[PDB]
């Protein structure tokens, strides 16, 4: 099924950090924790035990095995998925463990400011939804096309590279819900492109995302509550979504 509209947002918090990510578990689990990264690069993640903890800036610091770049990470099943800064390596870091798993996206743009999403200086966007685990990236072959790697969860390996043919120059940002890729306009306020990942075909999508045009750092669908999570100019937002 497809998204027909996005509701008014709920703001959870405003921080000084213009760019960052906030993330919650999306696996069918009782887990109230929140994970945050700040800025476009670093080696630390802040873990909050719950929302009141986030509200009061009471966090545990977790040191990562590799520096992250960008704002396109995701948390799924007690693991952080993220772009290893300055490489085409994607890292899966399980929070109670030492050695992460890694995979390489050999034909993906990953340096020299040739971003997948320029607004957020992002090269890769990891997304988790009802139909699988996905890595959105931009081709280093033609330097333009948006692709989505479909993952195998157990092996943390790529089973398929899906070419949308959509040029990244038209994309503001994106998220994936129920196996459908949704891409925003360059102003990041409307969704103007969509792609049925398992059907391998474009589908019509034109609906408003938000009224604010403030810079958009992170945009991510969480299948556990079916809400859009975003980070907008230091504002942590939640959007409800309406399916057809
Ligand atoms: Na996104």
PDB file of C-alpha atoms and ligand atoms in Angstrom:
ATOM      1  CA  UNK A   1       0.000   0.000   0.000  1.00  0.00           C
ATOM      2  CA  UNK A   2       1.006   3.587  -0.676  1.00  0.00           C
ATOM      3  CA  UNK A   3       1.205   6.762   1.404  1.00  0.00           C
ATOM      4  CA  UNK A   4      -1.520   9.280   0.568  1.00  0.00           C
ATOM      5  CA  UNK A   5      -0.567  12.039   3.034  1.00  0.00           C
ATOM      6  CA  UNK A   6       1.620  13.154   5.969  1.00  0.00           C
ATOM      7  CA  UNK A   7       0.131  14.723   9.110  1.00  0.00           C
ATOM      8  CA  UNK A   8       1.131  17.842  11.049  1.00  0.00           C
ATOM      9  CA  UNK A   9       4.368  17.271  12.945  1.00  0.00           C
ATOM     10  CA  UNK A  10       4.956  16.893  16.667  1.00  0.00           C
ATOM     11  CA  UNK A  11       8.147  18.537  17.881  1.00  0.00           C
ATOM     12  CA  UNK A  12      10.055  16.598  20.522  1.00  0.00           C
ATOM     13  CA  UNK A  13      13.025  18.860  21.162  1.00  0.00           C
ATOM     14  CA  UNK A  14      15.119  21.740  19.874  1.00  0.00           C
ATOM     15  CA  UNK A  15      18.904  21.616  20.144  1.00  0.00           C
ATOM     16  CA  UNK A  16      21.729  23.945  19.099  1.00  0.00           C
ATOM     17  CA  UNK A  17      23.092  21.353  16.664  1.00  0.00           C
ATOM     18  CA  UNK A  18      21.841  22.218  13.172  1.00  0.00           C
ATOM     19  CA  UNK A  19      22.542  18.758  11.776  1.00  0.00           C
ATOM     20  CA  UNK A  20      22.289  15.335  13.352  1.00  0.00           C
ATOM     21  CA  UNK A  21      20.159  12.219  13.705  1.00  0.00           C
ATOM     22  CA  UNK A  22      17.790  10.853  16.292  1.00  0.00           C
ATOM     23  CA  UNK A  23      16.777   7.207  16.084  1.00  0.00           C
ATOM     24  CA  UNK A  24      14.656   4.587  17.898  1.00  0.00           C
ATOM     25  CA  UNK A  25      14.349   0.809  17.581  1.00  0.00           C
ATOM     26  CA  UNK A  26      11.938  -0.272  14.814  1.00  0.00           C
ATOM     27  CA  UNK A  27      11.960  -3.985  15.544  1.00  0.00           C
ATOM     28  CA  UNK A  28       8.832  -5.273  17.274  1.00  0.00           C
ATOM     29  CA  UNK A  29      10.287  -4.665  20.735  1.00  0.00           C
ATOM     30  CA  UNK A  30       9.874  -2.936  24.052  1.00  0.00           C
ATOM     31  CA  UNK A  31      12.785  -0.517  23.802  1.00  0.00           C
ATOM     32  CA  UNK A  32      12.361   3.133  24.738  1.00  0.00           C
ATOM     33  CA  UNK A  33      15.971   4.102  24.021  1.00  0.00           C
ATOM     34  CA  UNK A  34      16.974   6.955  21.711  1.00  0.00           C
ATOM     35  CA  UNK A  35      20.279   7.273  19.882  1.00  0.00           C
ATOM     36  CA  UNK A  36      21.660  10.566  18.591  1.00  0.00           C
ATOM     37  CA  UNK A  37      24.590  11.650  16.450  1.00  0.00           C
ATOM     38  CA  UNK A  38      25.578  15.276  15.953  1.00  0.00           C
ATOM     39  CA  UNK A  39      27.159  17.108  13.012  1.00  0.00           C
ATOM     40  CA  UNK A  40      28.337  15.542   9.744  1.00  0.00           C
ATOM     41  CA  UNK A  41      31.115  13.380  11.200  1.00  0.00           C
ATOM     42  CA  UNK A  42      32.346  11.898  14.465  1.00  0.00           C
ATOM     43  CA  UNK A  43      33.063   8.721  16.402  1.00  0.00           C
ATOM     44  CA  UNK A  44      30.564   9.095  19.255  1.00  0.00           C
ATOM     45  CA  UNK A  45      26.886   8.222  19.623  1.00  0.00           C
ATOM     46  CA  UNK A  46      24.726   9.461  22.504  1.00  0.00           C
ATOM     47  CA  UNK A  47      22.338   6.902  23.982  1.00  0.00           C
ATOM     48  CA  UNK A  48      19.262   8.074  25.909  1.00  0.00           C
ATOM     49  CA  UNK A  49      17.328   5.590  28.033  1.00  0.00           C
ATOM     50  CA  UNK A  50      14.010   7.240  27.114  1.00  0.00           C
ATOM     51  CA  UNK A  51      12.339  10.438  25.926  1.00  0.00           C
ATOM     52  CA  UNK A  52      12.513  12.290  29.251  1.00  0.00           C
ATOM     53  CA  UNK A  53      16.257  11.519  29.264  1.00  0.00           C
ATOM     54  CA  UNK A  54      16.556  13.038  25.778  1.00  0.00           C
ATOM     55  CA  UNK A  55      14.524  16.051  26.929  1.00  0.00           C
ATOM     56  CA  UNK A  56      16.943  16.586  29.813  1.00  0.00           C
ATOM     57  CA  UNK A  57      20.131  15.836  27.889  1.00  0.00           C
ATOM     58  CA  UNK A  58      21.001  12.834  30.051  1.00  0.00           C
ATOM     59  CA  UNK A  59      22.938  10.413  27.870  1.00  0.00           C
ATOM     60  CA  UNK A  60      25.429   7.577  27.796  1.00  0.00           C
ATOM     61  CA  UNK A  61      28.315   8.003  25.339  1.00  0.00           C
ATOM     62  CA  UNK A  62      29.118   5.073  23.065  1.00  0.00           C
ATOM     63  CA  UNK A  63      32.438   5.025  21.184  1.00  0.00           C
ATOM     64  CA  UNK A  64      32.107   3.635  17.642  1.00  0.00           C
ATOM     65  CA  UNK A  65      34.611   1.302  15.898  1.00  0.00           C
ATOM     66  CA  UNK A  66      34.845   3.730  12.956  1.00  0.00           C
ATOM     67  CA  UNK A  67      34.031   7.394  12.356  1.00  0.00           C
ATOM     68  CA  UNK A  68      30.603   8.027  10.879  1.00  0.00           C
ATOM     69  CA  UNK A  69      29.803  10.470   8.122  1.00  0.00           C
ATOM     70  CA  UNK A  70      26.443  12.074   7.422  1.00  0.00           C
ATOM     71  CA  UNK A  71      22.953  11.854   8.855  1.00  0.00           C
ATOM     72  CA  UNK A  72      21.683   8.729   7.131  1.00  0.00           C
ATOM     73  CA  UNK A  73      22.102   6.072   9.819  1.00  0.00           C
ATOM     74  CA  UNK A  74      19.437   3.812  11.259  1.00  0.00           C
ATOM     75  CA  UNK A  75      19.022   1.617  14.319  1.00  0.00           C
ATOM     76  CA  UNK A  76      17.543  -1.847  13.911  1.00  0.00           C
ATOM     77  CA  UNK A  77      17.536  -4.789  16.283  1.00  0.00           C
ATOM     78  CA  UNK A  78      19.954  -3.222  18.779  1.00  0.00           C
ATOM     79  CA  UNK A  79      22.407  -2.343  15.998  1.00  0.00           C
ATOM     80  CA  UNK A  80      23.532   0.932  14.437  1.00  0.00           C
ATOM     81  CA  UNK A  81      23.849   0.944  10.625  1.00  0.00           C
ATOM     82  CA  UNK A  82      26.053   3.738   9.291  1.00  0.00           C
ATOM     83  CA  UNK A  83      28.417   5.090   6.670  1.00  0.00           C
ATOM     84  CA  UNK A  84      32.140   4.759   7.560  1.00  0.00           C
ATOM     85  CA  UNK A  85      33.515   8.239   6.879  1.00  0.00           C
ATOM     86  CA  UNK A  86      35.719   8.490   3.784  1.00  0.00           C
ATOM     87  CA  UNK A  87      35.049   4.958   2.571  1.00  0.00           C
ATOM     88  CA  UNK A  88      32.417   3.063   0.623  1.00  0.00           C
ATOM     89  CA  UNK A  89      32.067   0.826   3.686  1.00  0.00           C
ATOM     90  CA  UNK A  90      28.793   0.507   5.575  1.00  0.00           C
ATOM     91  CA  UNK A  91      29.063  -0.513   9.231  1.00  0.00           C
ATOM     92  CA  UNK A  92      26.669  -2.588  11.302  1.00  0.00           C
ATOM     93  CA  UNK A  93      27.550  -2.037  14.966  1.00  0.00           C
ATOM     94  CA  UNK A  94      25.686  -4.136  17.540  1.00  0.00           C
ATOM     95  CA  UNK A  95      25.463  -2.100  20.728  1.00  0.00           C
ATOM     96  CA  UNK A  96      26.501  -4.899  23.091  1.00  0.00           C
ATOM     97  CA  UNK A  97      29.577  -5.998  21.173  1.00  0.00           C
ATOM     98  CA  UNK A  98      33.111  -5.217  19.966  1.00  0.00           C
ATOM     99  CA  UNK A  99      33.467  -6.288  16.337  1.00  0.00           C
ATOM    100  CA  UNK A 100      31.032  -4.722  13.863  1.00  0.00           C
ATOM    101  CA  UNK A 101      30.100  -6.281  10.561  1.00  0.00           C
ATOM    102  CA  UNK A 102      30.953  -4.407   7.382  1.00  0.00           C
ATOM    103  CA  UNK A 103      29.986  -4.377   3.728  1.00  0.00           C
ATOM    104  CA  UNK A 104      31.322  -2.397   0.784  1.00  0.00           C
ATOM    105  CA  UNK A 105      29.307  -0.650  -1.914  1.00  0.00           C
ATOM    106  CA  UNK A 106      31.909  -0.708  -4.659  1.00  0.00           C
ATOM    107  CA  UNK A 107      30.118   1.489  -7.182  1.00  0.00           C
ATOM    108  CA  UNK A 108      28.761   4.167  -4.856  1.00  0.00           C
ATOM    109  CA  UNK A 109      29.792   7.794  -4.514  1.00  0.00           C
ATOM    110  CA  UNK A 110      31.486   8.270  -1.157  1.00  0.00           C
ATOM    111  CA  UNK A 111      33.831  11.261  -1.187  1.00  0.00           C
ATOM    112  CA  UNK A 112      34.801  14.533  -2.860  1.00  0.00           C
ATOM    113  CA  UNK A 113      31.423  16.080  -1.966  1.00  0.00           C
ATOM    114  CA  UNK A 114      29.538  14.131  -4.609  1.00  0.00           C
ATOM    115  CA  UNK A 115      26.644  13.474  -2.243  1.00  0.00           C
ATOM    116  CA  UNK A 116      23.550  11.339  -2.612  1.00  0.00           C
ATOM    117  CA  UNK A 117      21.713  14.060  -0.636  1.00  0.00           C
ATOM    118  CA  UNK A 118      23.606  17.356  -0.844  1.00  0.00           C
ATOM    119  CA  UNK A 119      21.323  19.214   1.609  1.00  0.00           C
ATOM    120  CA  UNK A 120      22.506  16.887   4.359  1.00  0.00           C
ATOM    121  CA  UNK A 121      25.951  16.042   2.907  1.00  0.00           C
ATOM    122  CA  UNK A 122      24.892  12.405   2.889  1.00  0.00           C
ATOM    123  CA  UNK A 123      26.337   9.626   0.751  1.00  0.00           C
ATOM    124  CA  UNK A 124      24.306   6.681   2.054  1.00  0.00           C
ATOM    125  CA  UNK A 125      20.913   6.373   3.665  1.00  0.00           C
ATOM    126  CA  UNK A 126      20.172   3.155   5.552  1.00  0.00           C
ATOM    127  CA  UNK A 127      16.461   2.482   5.925  1.00  0.00           C
ATOM    128  CA  UNK A 128      14.446  -0.274   7.579  1.00  0.00           C
ATOM    129  CA  UNK A 129      10.795  -1.017   6.884  1.00  0.00           C
ATOM    130  CA  UNK A 130       8.175  -3.767   6.607  1.00  0.00           C
ATOM    131  CA  UNK A 131       9.733  -5.200   3.449  1.00  0.00           C
ATOM    132  CA  UNK A 132      13.431  -5.262   4.326  1.00  0.00           C
ATOM    133  CA  UNK A 133      16.690  -3.474   5.042  1.00  0.00           C
ATOM    134  CA  UNK A 134      17.777  -0.971   2.435  1.00  0.00           C
ATOM    135  CA  UNK A 135      20.756   1.199   1.581  1.00  0.00           C
ATOM    136  CA  UNK A 136      20.095   4.180  -0.645  1.00  0.00           C
ATOM    137  CA  UNK A 137      23.124   5.443  -2.571  1.00  0.00           C
ATOM    138  CA  UNK A 138      24.221   7.264  -5.724  1.00  0.00           C
ATOM    139  CA  UNK A 139      26.123   5.608  -8.593  1.00  0.00           C
ATOM    140  CA  UNK A 140      29.845   6.308  -8.991  1.00  0.00           C
ATOM    141  CA  UNK A 141      29.462   4.928 -12.520  1.00  0.00           C
ATOM    142  CA  UNK A 142      27.315   7.767 -13.905  1.00  0.00           C
ATOM    143  CA  UNK A 143      27.693  10.049 -10.886  1.00  0.00           C
ATOM    144  CA  UNK A 144      23.927  10.623 -10.807  1.00  0.00           C
ATOM    145  CA  UNK A 145      21.520   7.683 -10.597  1.00  0.00           C
ATOM    146  CA  UNK A 146      19.922   6.799  -7.274  1.00  0.00           C
ATOM    147  CA  UNK A 147      20.122   3.115  -6.369  1.00  0.00           C
ATOM    148  CA  UNK A 148      18.885   1.071  -3.425  1.00  0.00           C
ATOM    149  CA  UNK A 149      20.804  -1.960  -2.187  1.00  0.00           C
ATOM    150  CA  UNK A 150      18.512  -4.621  -0.771  1.00  0.00           C
ATOM    151  CA  UNK A 151      20.214  -6.415   2.121  1.00  0.00           C
ATOM    152  CA  UNK A 152      20.274  -9.858   3.636  1.00  0.00           C
ATOM    153  CA  UNK A 153      19.879  -9.242   7.368  1.00  0.00           C
ATOM    154  CA  UNK A 154      21.729 -12.322   8.623  1.00  0.00           C
ATOM    155  CA  UNK A 155      24.882 -11.932   6.543  1.00  0.00           C
ATOM    156  CA  UNK A 156      24.814  -8.141   6.260  1.00  0.00           C
ATOM    157  CA  UNK A 157      25.425  -8.476   2.518  1.00  0.00           C
ATOM    158  CA  UNK A 158      23.798  -7.061  -0.605  1.00  0.00           C
ATOM    159  CA  UNK A 159      21.433  -9.338  -2.489  1.00  0.00           C
ATOM    160  CA  UNK A 160      20.252  -6.862  -5.115  1.00  0.00           C
ATOM    161  CA  UNK A 161      21.135  -3.432  -6.495  1.00  0.00           C
ATOM    162  CA  UNK A 162      17.960  -1.671  -7.603  1.00  0.00           C
ATOM    163  CA  UNK A 163      18.344   1.165 -10.103  1.00  0.00           C
ATOM    164  CA  UNK A 164      15.595   3.789  -9.852  1.00  0.00           C
ATOM    165  CA  UNK A 165      17.254   5.812 -12.654  1.00  0.00           C
ATOM    166  CA  UNK A 166      16.216   8.918 -10.717  1.00  0.00           C
ATOM    167  CA  UNK A 167      18.894  11.624 -10.794  1.00  0.00           C
ATOM    168  CA  UNK A 168      20.161  12.700  -7.363  1.00  0.00           C
ATOM    169  CA  UNK A 169      20.119  16.313  -8.534  1.00  0.00           C
ATOM    170  CA  UNK A 170      16.323  16.158  -8.267  1.00  0.00           C
ATOM    171  CA  UNK A 171      16.348  14.604  -4.784  1.00  0.00           C
ATOM    172  CA  UNK A 172      16.199  16.485  -1.510  1.00  0.00           C
ATOM    173  CA  UNK A 173      16.079  13.434   0.709  1.00  0.00           C
ATOM    174  CA  UNK A 174      14.142  10.188   1.011  1.00  0.00           C
ATOM    175  CA  UNK A 175      12.602   7.452   3.133  1.00  0.00           C
ATOM    176  CA  UNK A 176      11.207   3.986   2.573  1.00  0.00           C
ATOM    177  CA  UNK A 177       7.895   2.627   3.816  1.00  0.00           C
ATOM    178  CA  UNK A 178       6.187  -0.661   3.018  1.00  0.00           C
ATOM    179  CA  UNK A 179       8.720  -1.403   0.275  1.00  0.00           C
ATOM    180  CA  UNK A 180       8.172   1.888  -1.518  1.00  0.00           C
ATOM    181  CA  UNK A 181      10.913   4.489  -1.903  1.00  0.00           C
ATOM    182  CA  UNK A 182       9.742   8.077  -1.416  1.00  0.00           C
ATOM    183  CA  UNK A 183      11.939  10.970  -2.543  1.00  0.00           C
ATOM    184  CA  UNK A 184      11.510  14.653  -1.707  1.00  0.00           C
ATOM    185  CA  UNK A 185      12.041  17.685  -3.953  1.00  0.00           C
ATOM    186  CA  UNK A 186      15.260  19.711  -3.570  1.00  0.00           C
ATOM    187  CA  UNK A 187      13.499  22.097  -1.163  1.00  0.00           C
ATOM    188  CA  UNK A 188      12.561  19.094   0.986  1.00  0.00           C
ATOM    189  CA  UNK A 189       8.889  20.009   1.490  1.00  0.00           C
ATOM    190  CA  UNK A 190       7.066  17.787  -1.013  1.00  0.00           C
ATOM    191  CA  UNK A 191       7.444  14.164  -2.063  1.00  0.00           C
ATOM    192  CA  UNK A 192       7.546  14.243  -5.859  1.00  0.00           C
ATOM    193  CA  UNK A 193       8.984  10.834  -6.827  1.00  0.00           C
ATOM    194  CA  UNK A 194       8.399   7.254  -5.679  1.00  0.00           C
ATOM    195  CA  UNK A 195       9.630   3.809  -6.672  1.00  0.00           C
ATOM    196  CA  UNK A 196       8.198   0.382  -5.923  1.00  0.00           C
ATOM    197  CA  UNK A 197      11.406  -1.386  -4.915  1.00  0.00           C
ATOM    198  CA  UNK A 198      10.274  -5.019  -5.225  1.00  0.00           C
ATOM    199  CA  UNK A 199       8.164  -4.269  -8.291  1.00  0.00           C
ATOM    200  CA  UNK A 200      11.102  -2.426  -9.829  1.00  0.00           C
ATOM    201  CA  UNK A 201       8.952   0.362 -11.244  1.00  0.00           C
ATOM    202  CA  UNK A 202       8.272   4.052 -10.773  1.00  0.00           C
ATOM    203  CA  UNK A 203       4.935   5.003  -9.228  1.00  0.00           C
ATOM    204  CA  UNK A 204       3.126   8.321  -8.936  1.00  0.00           C
ATOM    205  CA  UNK A 205       3.637  10.269  -5.753  1.00  0.00           C
ATOM    206  CA  UNK A 206       2.828  13.929  -5.197  1.00  0.00           C
ATOM    207  CA  UNK A 207       1.982  14.995  -1.668  1.00  0.00           C
ATOM    208  CA  UNK A 208       3.082  17.611   0.827  1.00  0.00           C
ATOM    209  CA  UNK A 209       5.630  16.594   3.446  1.00  0.00           C
ATOM    210  CA  UNK A 210       5.941  19.795   5.482  1.00  0.00           C
ATOM    211  CA  UNK A 211       5.463  23.564   5.323  1.00  0.00           C
ATOM    212  CA  UNK A 212       8.786  24.590   6.851  1.00  0.00           C
ATOM    213  CA  UNK A 213      11.683  24.994   4.449  1.00  0.00           C
ATOM    214  CA  UNK A 214      14.317  24.966   7.197  1.00  0.00           C
ATOM    215  CA  UNK A 215      17.313  22.777   6.321  1.00  0.00           C
ATOM    216  CA  UNK A 216      16.584  19.055   6.651  1.00  0.00           C
ATOM    217  CA  UNK A 217      19.291  16.864   8.147  1.00  0.00           C
ATOM    218  CA  UNK A 218      17.611  13.467   8.608  1.00  0.00           C
ATOM    219  CA  UNK A 219      14.419  11.875   7.279  1.00  0.00           C
ATOM    220  CA  UNK A 220      13.555   8.322   8.245  1.00  0.00           C
ATOM    221  CA  UNK A 221      10.509   6.052   8.460  1.00  0.00           C
ATOM    222  CA  UNK A 222      10.080   3.933  11.602  1.00  0.00           C
ATOM    223  CA  UNK A 223       7.905   0.879  10.990  1.00  0.00           C
ATOM    224  CA  UNK A 224       7.221   0.292  14.700  1.00  0.00           C
ATOM    225  CA  UNK A 225       5.107   3.458  15.039  1.00  0.00           C
ATOM    226  CA  UNK A 226       4.678   4.216  11.332  1.00  0.00           C
ATOM    227  CA  UNK A 227       5.971   7.748  11.900  1.00  0.00           C
ATOM    228  CA  UNK A 228       8.481   9.838   9.990  1.00  0.00           C
ATOM    229  CA  UNK A 229      11.417  10.911  12.129  1.00  0.00           C
ATOM    230  CA  UNK A 230      13.282  14.044  11.093  1.00  0.00           C
ATOM    231  CA  UNK A 231      15.983  16.469  12.203  1.00  0.00           C
ATOM    232  CA  UNK A 232      15.320  19.975  10.906  1.00  0.00           C
ATOM    233  CA  UNK A 233      17.661  22.828  11.772  1.00  0.00           C
ATOM    234  CA  UNK A 234      18.097  21.469  15.304  1.00  0.00           C
ATOM    235  CA  UNK A 235      14.419  20.549  15.640  1.00  0.00           C
ATOM    236  CA  UNK A 236      13.590  16.910  16.364  1.00  0.00           C
ATOM    237  CA  UNK A 237      10.236  16.132  14.683  1.00  0.00           C
ATOM    238  CA  UNK A 238       7.712  13.276  14.409  1.00  0.00           C
ATOM    239  CA  UNK A 239       5.241  13.064  11.488  1.00  0.00           C
ATOM    240  CA  UNK A 240       2.311  10.641  11.354  1.00  0.00           C
ATOM    241  CA  UNK A 241       1.730   9.068   7.954  1.00  0.00           C
ATOM    242  CA  UNK A 242      -1.533   8.078   6.316  1.00  0.00           C
ATOM    243  CA  UNK A 243      -1.620   4.948   4.146  1.00  0.00           C
ATOM    244  CA  UNK A 244      -4.269   4.318   1.498  1.00  0.00           C
TER     245      UNK A 244
HETATM  246 NA1  LIG B   1      16.387   9.977   4.531  1.00  0.00          NA
END
